[PDB]
Amino acid sequence: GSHMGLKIQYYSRKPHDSAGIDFSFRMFNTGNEAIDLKDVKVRYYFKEDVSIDEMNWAVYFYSLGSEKDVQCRFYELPGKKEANKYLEITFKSGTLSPNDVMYITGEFYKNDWTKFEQRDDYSYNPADSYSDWKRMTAYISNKLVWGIEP
Ligand SMILES: [Ca+2]
């Protein structure tokens, strides 16, 4: 009984052209040790020509505490054919015991209110139910534990 593990499931009911990108997801502790969410980050990858400072994000719900405890930031991802941006989600608090699940809800937008095209976004899963989603990644202490980077 000696390893940590996470798994992400997510889906978006937004149409492929959308003002908001929904990054709401759930995450399970699949290992056999409790996890401090302060050590965890998650990435949602996409493609956009706008600068990271031309987008804004919001988190509306966090099952393990206040929504204020979920902090996000946009980053550039250069030199990759499959994506050129990610939103990284981090946590100020929260604990997940083995087999427990957490949820967040959140969306991001362009400052100029123009629409995103999501068909070229690596992490987009247009669906109406949960399944394991390998195109969002999760890390513990900066080590990759779930998913596949672009
Ligand atoms: Ca896009």
Curated annotation (Swiss-Prot):
It comes from the Bacteria. Residues 5-150 form the CBM3 domain. Ca(2+) binds at K47, E117, D120, D121. Interacts (via RsgI N-terminal anti-sigma domain) with SigI1. It comes from Acetivibrio thermocellus (strain ATCC 27405 / DSM 1237 / JCM 9322 / NBRC 103400 / NCIMB 10682 / NRRL B-4536 / VPI 7372) (Clostridium thermocellum). Anti-sigma factor for SigI1. Negatively regulates SigI1 activity through direct interaction. Binding of the polysaccharide substrate to the extracellular C-terminal sensing domain of RsgI1 may induce a conformational change in its N-terminal cytoplasmic region, leading to the release and activation of SigI1. The CBM3 domain binds to cellulose. This is Anti-sigma-I factor RsgI1. It is found in: Cell membrane.
